Amino acid sequence: EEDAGLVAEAEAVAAGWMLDFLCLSLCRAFRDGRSEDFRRTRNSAEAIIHGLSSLTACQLRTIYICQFLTRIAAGKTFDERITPLESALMIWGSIEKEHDKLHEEIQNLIKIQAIAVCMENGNFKEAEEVFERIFGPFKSKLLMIISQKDTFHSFFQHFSYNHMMEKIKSYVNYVLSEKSSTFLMKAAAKVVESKR
Amino acid sequence: EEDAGLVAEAEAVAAGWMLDFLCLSLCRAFRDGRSEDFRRTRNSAEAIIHGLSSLTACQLRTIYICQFLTRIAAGKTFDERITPLESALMIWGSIEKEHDKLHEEIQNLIKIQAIAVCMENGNFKEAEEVFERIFGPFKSKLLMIISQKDTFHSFFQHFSYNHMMEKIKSYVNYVLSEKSSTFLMKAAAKVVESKR
Ligand SMILES: COCC(=O)NCc1ccccc1
Ligand SMILES: COCC(=O)NCc1ccccc1
């Protein structure tokens, strides 16, 4: 007989398979709004990721998408001394991905919702602290909104939580379609289709 | 397209595959004495087991073997208000398995080591408490040994920690050989063999 190195290699291949499968499940639970399922899959993905010490460019992209969705899911709820949405913003700006229209739309919606979720929770001192960290005449208008506790300002209705979630969900559908063919999920589906 | 029920079924099949793979890895790490690898695989197995709500007779046996090895590995280190080895003893006596010579040998070695590890750590009041919970003229001899702090008594040399670990390791080799053919590890090895 038994070679330790070849067994460790087989375990690394299987960890790679489990990572893609759990990213796929995390994406579907996020899209579906299945919170408890998302929590469980996130816990599993995090544990499996600890079993890997070297990651390829594709695997790094996979773990960062998982970390990003984890912070987005904790958006209305931590070493950092920033908020979950501010942490999602840092991950989003560092993933190896195209900075296209969708990327910029998601970035700006997260920037504004990082402030709006603090106002929604009644913590306006924190909303000013988040604003200072992100931004830190457009800025003067946003800082006046927070100062006046003008939570339902028309600006916040265009840059809403629901709009942020919808744009992120559209991005998740592209990740979901790119990984729907990964080894583990594909083999699992073939077993279920044989039953039936 | 997309059926929620068929996707959930494919995820349950894949969780079942991951469970056997992680049990195999936990068994090899236990046999090899790779403590940090055992800790990581245990964390992964525990997270994956949370993703299952219904288990077959075979899967229940798998999770209980994992729980048993986890308590054995924590033997010298928790709802219960008993010790890790006492907890392993409860799992061992309830697994759906044959109560053969090896089973009885492992049971008795765990019973004595649950007391001896307390003496090894210098906690003799705890050694008496463990003795009372398990047992609770043979008993009178064991209670005299603990009372006299006679840690290196010849009885403890036949019913040693090393003998307990060796007998448990032989049992692990049977579990290891029964699962070496499971889907995930078998497919992982075929990929590594194609490289080499
Ligand atoms: C807090 O720092 C660690 C961290 O990023 N945990 C979140 C996570 C969720 C899912 C997969 C990997 C990681
Ligand atoms: C403490 O109660 C929960 C428990 O048994 N955790 C240990 C465990 C280790 C590996 C697989 C499943 C479980």
Catalogue all structural domains in chain B, each as residue range(s) with its CATH number. Answer: 2-73+179-195 (1.25.40.210), 81-135+137-159 (1.25.40.210)
Could B43 and A44 be called an inter-chain contact, meaning their C-beta atoms sit closer than 8 Å?
A: no
Residue among B42, B44, B72, B92 to mutate when testing ligand 2 (max atoms within 8 A of CB): B42
Q: For residue A10, give the 3-state DSSP assignment.
A: helix
Task: Tell me the C-alpha to C-alpha distance, in Å, between residue A151 and each of A82, A148, B89.
Answer: 21, 8, 59
B125 within 8 A of B115, measured Cβ to Cβ:
no
Q: Report CA torsion sign: B110, B112, B117, B120.
A: negative
Q: What is the C-alpha to C-alpha distance for residues A73 and B151, in angstroms, rounded to an integer?
A: 54
Residue B139 has which token pair? 């008993």
**Helix (H/G/I), strand (E/B), else coil: A157:** helix
Q: Which of A13, A25, A48 sits opposite B11 (nearest CB)?
A: A25
The amino acid at residue A145 is: I
> What are the angstrom distances between the C-alpha of B196 and each of A6, A8, A9, B3?
10, 14, 11, 40
Chain B residues within an 8 Å CB radius of A184: 14, 17, 184
Nearest to B185 among A10, A28, A183 (CB): A10
With CA atoms as reference, report the closest residue to B76 among B169, B164, B174, B179.
B164
φ, ψ dihedrals at B149, nearest 5°:
50, 40
Both tokens of B155, joined, read 């009885």
Specify whether the CB–CB gap between A66 and A26 falls below 8 A.
yes
Instruction: Give the Cα separation of A8 and A15 in Å (integer).
Output: 10
Sign of the C-alpha dihedral computed for residues A133, A102, A37 and A162 taken in this order: positive
Q: Is there a contact between A142 and A154 (Cβ–Cβ < 8 Å)?
A: no
Residue count (chain A): 196
Q: Quote the DSSP letter at residue A83.
A: -
Q: Which two tokens stand for residue A120?
A: 């929604």
In B115-132, which positions are buried (b, 16+ CB within 10 angstroms) versus exposed (e)? Answer: bbbbbeeeebebbbbbbe
H or E element that contains A74: none
Ligand having the closest approach to the CA of A74 = 1
CA distances from A154 to A116, A138, A177, B1 (A): 12, 14, 35, 37
The Cα–Cα gap between A193 and B7 comes to: 11
Contact between B165 and B88 (Cβ < 8 Å):
no
The DSSP H or E segment spanning B133 is helix B124-134
Amino acid in position A7 = V
- Sequence-distant (6+) residues with CB within 8 A of A25 are A37, A41, B11
Tokens for B73, please give them: 């590995």
Question: B4-32 vs B35-50: helix axis angle to the nearest 10?
Answer: 160
Taking residue B17's Cβ as centre, other Cβ atoms within 10 Å add up to: 24
DSSP assigned state of A65 = H
Output the CA torsion sign for B109, B114, B115, B120: positive
- CA separation for the pair A194, B4 (Å, rounded): 17
A100's tokens: 């296209």
* Gap between the Cα atoms of B52 and B74, Å rounded: 25
CA distance B18 to A176: 21
The residues, ordered by sequence, that sit 6+ positions from A23 with a Cβ below 8 Å of its Cβ are A45, A62, A65, A66, A175, A179
Of B14, B17, B18, B23, give the one whose Cα is nearest residue B42. Answer: B23
Resolution (A): 2.2
Q: How far apart are CA B48 and CA B184, in angstroms?
A: 14
Shortest Cα distance, chain A CAs vs residue B188, angstroms:
5
- Quote the distance between the C-alpha of residue A188 and its chain's center: 25
- Residues A174/A106, Cβ–Cβ less than 8 Å: no
For CA atoms B184, B187, B189, B195, give the dihedral sign.
negative
How many residues would you count in chain B?
Answer: 196
Residues 6+ apart with CB under 8 A from B109: B159, B160, B163, B164, B167, B168
Which of B49, B184, B185, B190 is the best residue to mutate to test the A interface, defined by the most A CB atoms within 10 Å of its own CB?
A: B184
| C-alpha B52, offset from chain centre | 20
- Per the CB < 8 A criterion, the answer to whether A188 and B17 are in contact is yes
Which method was it determined by? X-ray
The minimal CB distance from B10 to the residues A11, A183, A192 is found for A192
Rounded to whole angstroms, the Cα distance separating B89 from B68 reads 8
